[PDB]
Amino acid sequence: ADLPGKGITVNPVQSTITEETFQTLLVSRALEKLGYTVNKPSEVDYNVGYTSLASGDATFTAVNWTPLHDNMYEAAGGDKKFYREGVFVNGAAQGYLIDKKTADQYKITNIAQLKDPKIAKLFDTNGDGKADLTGCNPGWGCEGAINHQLAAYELTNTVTHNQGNYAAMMADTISRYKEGKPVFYYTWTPYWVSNELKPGKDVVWLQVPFSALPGDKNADTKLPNGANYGFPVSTMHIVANKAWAEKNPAAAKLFAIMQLPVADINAQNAIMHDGKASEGDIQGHVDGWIKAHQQQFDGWVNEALAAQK
Ligand SMILES: C[N+]1(C)CCC[C@H]1C(=O)O
Numbered sequence: 001a002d003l004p005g006k007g008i009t010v011n012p013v014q015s016t017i018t019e020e021t022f023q024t025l026l027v028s029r030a031l032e033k034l035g036y037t038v039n040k041p042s043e044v045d046y047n048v049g050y051t052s053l054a055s056g057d058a059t060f061t062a063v064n065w066t067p068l069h070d071n072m073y074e075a076a077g078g079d080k081k082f083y084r085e086g087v088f089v090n091g092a093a094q095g096y097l098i099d100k101k102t103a104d105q106y107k108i109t110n111i112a113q114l115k116d117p118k119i120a121k122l123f124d125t126n127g128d129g130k131a132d133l134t135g136c137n138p139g140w141g142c143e144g145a146i147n148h149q150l151a152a153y154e155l156t157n158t159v160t161h162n163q164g165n166y167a168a169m170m171a172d173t174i175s176r177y178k179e180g181k182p183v184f185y186y187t188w189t190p191y192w193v194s195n196e197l198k199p200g201k202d203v204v205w206l207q208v209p210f211s212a213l214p215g216d217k218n219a220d221t222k223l224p225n226g227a228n229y230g231f232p233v234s235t236m237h238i239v240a241n242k243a244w245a246e247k248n249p250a251a252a253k254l255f256a257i258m259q260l261p262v263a264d265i266n267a268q269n270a271i272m273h274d275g276k277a278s279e280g281d282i283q284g285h286v287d288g289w290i291k292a293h294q295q296q297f298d299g300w301v302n303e304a305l306a307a308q309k
Pocket of ligand 1: 046069136140142188
């Protein structure tokens, strides 16, 4: 009769990106149905998350990105210290965008065109002549990807990687876009930005001149027709402490089979951004998703409970 997680405490970890909370708590709810006591997530830098997971201070994360986290994953112990099975979120996109108005006028389709200082000046916001790319916070996996690519594409003389607080910077970028000025930024899905600036209407994605990712000399981000946006279709995974997973087969199975559509996280993140972003609202987003997918959610729980436990 007794549920397998009775008496066992779970510590989730995510980053300080509040938009990660929904998917983290979805896993927490599932573990609670398996009987576990789940604490509120710790919100720490990704790299701190991975070392905590490897030591056993943290139990799971649900925001492990491939390939952007590969270097942090391997560095912290890789498959020797971590359990990682299945695919939690498929079909994420990332890349570089400029406003469609500017792209159409000057016929800009490739980031390599920003080597021309005249083109780059269009996107200068601080007057130093260089294009100002709204980029990634220190510690994000995309920090390393963007730095690597600007160097590889010979863009460091005309393009600046602006770093700080991405969410605040993007509000300024949207404000500038609304004044009718050119903008240049990196983003990903799922996140709230793509709801405000939509490709084909407001903005366009830029291609890159060849494949370049840090730590993999033979990376190939090309699509079958030869078009390249600089990043592959990306996925998120649930990652757990390996030793904990070996002792908790019901949880291990649950982690391998849970799946959340990228569109659902996009929708939740958009609602948060329109003002409903308190802890209490996010809990209700999670509870409402479950009620709307009750058969699926219960199926995951039933499969986990039927593991050899
Ligand atoms: C901030 N991010 C959510 C953007 C894509 C993956 C991740 C990161 O760069 O690590």
